[PDB]
């Protein structure tokens, strides 16, 4: 909730968005941001947990020209919901069918307009059995996610267009062991009985792991490792 932890790195900042999206109930989340007077959507700051196969197909097909939500973001500041009414033309109909194969059927996108002219979009998708159930859930968390859009825009605008040199991290056999167990949601005590160690032992290892990544929370560091193909 209000633990507005804003890091100084792209990877951690992206991990906190995925952490907050899953905590709210959303399965997938995407954050896009473009500099002031830029119109090149392929060369844009895009982060999140969308399927990598879908993101690659999306850019190769130039879907930013057909996608109705990015067109909506250039003209409005109000959200647009992934309703069948937003896909009008024939190309947008094919876009909806293929996007669903990637799992993006229900959701919404929040248009981003920064103070220095940045243009972007924050997309969140939800898994539900029907559109009526999905629409009821998104309406329940719509006010809280409305605040998340502006907080992610203000904190993300500073780290979107930098190019920091990340230093490679490597963990011991024990550290990489307790981290993948923490990634699936096991608390510190539960990892102690699985690995047959004390609870202070696993808490000591997570502290070293969090310093190696440069983070201030274990759950954020856990999803960061799987982003670089380190665990699972």
């Amino acid at each position: 909730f209000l633990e507005l932890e804003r890091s100084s790195g792209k990877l951690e900042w992206s991990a906190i968005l995925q952490k907050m999206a899953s905590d709210l109930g959303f399965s997938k989340i995407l954050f896009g941001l473009l500099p002031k007077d830029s119109q090149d959507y392929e060369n844009a700051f895009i982060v999140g947990n969308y399927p990598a196969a879908w993101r690659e197909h999306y850019d190769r097909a130039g879907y930013a020209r057909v996608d109705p939500t990015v067109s909506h973001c250039t003209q409005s500041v109000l959200p647009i919901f992934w309703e069948p009414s937003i896909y009008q033309t024939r190309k947008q109909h094919e876009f909806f069918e293929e996007a669903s194969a990637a799992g993006l059927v229900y959701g919404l996108t929040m248009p981003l307009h920064g103070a220095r002219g940045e243009l972007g979009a924050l997309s969140l998708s939800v898994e539900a059995e029907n559109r009526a159930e999905a629409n009821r859930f998104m309406e329940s968390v719509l006010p809280t996610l409305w605040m998340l859009k502006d907080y992610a825009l203000q904190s993300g605008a500073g780290l979107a267009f930098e190019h920091p040199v990340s230093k490679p991290v490597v963990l011991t056999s024990r550290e990489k062991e307790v981290l993948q167990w923490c990634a699936i949601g096991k608390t510190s005590w539960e990892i102690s009985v699985i690995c047959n160690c004390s609870e202070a032992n696993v808490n000591f290892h997570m502290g070293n792991i969090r310093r190696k990544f440069g983070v201030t929370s274990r759950r954020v560091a856990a999803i960061m490792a799987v982003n670089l193909g380190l665990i699972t």
Binding site: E3, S188, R210, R211, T216, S217, R219
Partner: protein
């Protein structure tokens, strides 16, 4: 003097966040863990900077 280590204020925010989460008495948490993790990580980050003293 004022050194080039704006980490003490970082620890102040981590301890104050722990100070805010400690007020929730009788609430029956993931917020407690993050508060402790931030406190340990912030204090440990200061300590690694607090050992490069060089006399």
């Amino acid at each position: 003097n004022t050194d080039l280590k704006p980490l003490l204020d970082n620890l102040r925010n981590a301890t104050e966040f722990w100070n805010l989460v400690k007020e929730a008495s009788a609430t029956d948490n993931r917020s407690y863990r993050d508060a402790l993790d931030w406190l340990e990580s912030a204090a440990l980050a200061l300590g690694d900077a607090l050992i490069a003293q060089r006399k």
